[PDB]
């Protein structure tokens with residue numbers, strides 16, 4: 001059958017919202033009021049992959065855009081990128097592994113681990129106006145847990 005998807009927003013556990021910071025970067029900042037329209041709306045697709053009660057493979061596309069969050073090596077390091085795809089072919093149920101995150105329930109919140117790079121997570125910084133990135137160090141003040149808000 002088709003792939004199933006939900007529209008949603010994400011905020012980090014410090015309650016920063018995610019906005020596009022150019023065509024291919026996301027940044028996290030504290031947002032409230034009129035400026036909340038700036039936040040990115042995701043289409044979260046429920047994709048093929050290893051699954052358990054608390055760990056659900058997803059892709060994170062930008063709603064109304066042929067753009068997906070993507071985990072690749074860049075200058076020999078696992079990195080988060082926004083990658084363009086052929087809009088005729090996406091979303092699909094068998095997304096390529098660079099596009100897959102394991103959405104994990106953690107202490108009433110959500111973590112997004114790279115399926116491609118075990119124990120690398122979608123991360124934000126403490127400071128505002130910094131990129132969303134793929135973090136692979138568990139020590140430090142980087143934020144790896146989020147809440148989801150459902151969108152019409």
Ligand SMILES: Cn1cc(C(N)=O)c([C@@H]2CCCNC2)n1
Nearest residue numbers: 037038039040041042062063064
């Ligand atoms: C058509 N469209 C979809 C999205 C999105 N997936 O976030 C957008 C952004 C929303 C934030 C304001 N700029 C444009 N525009």
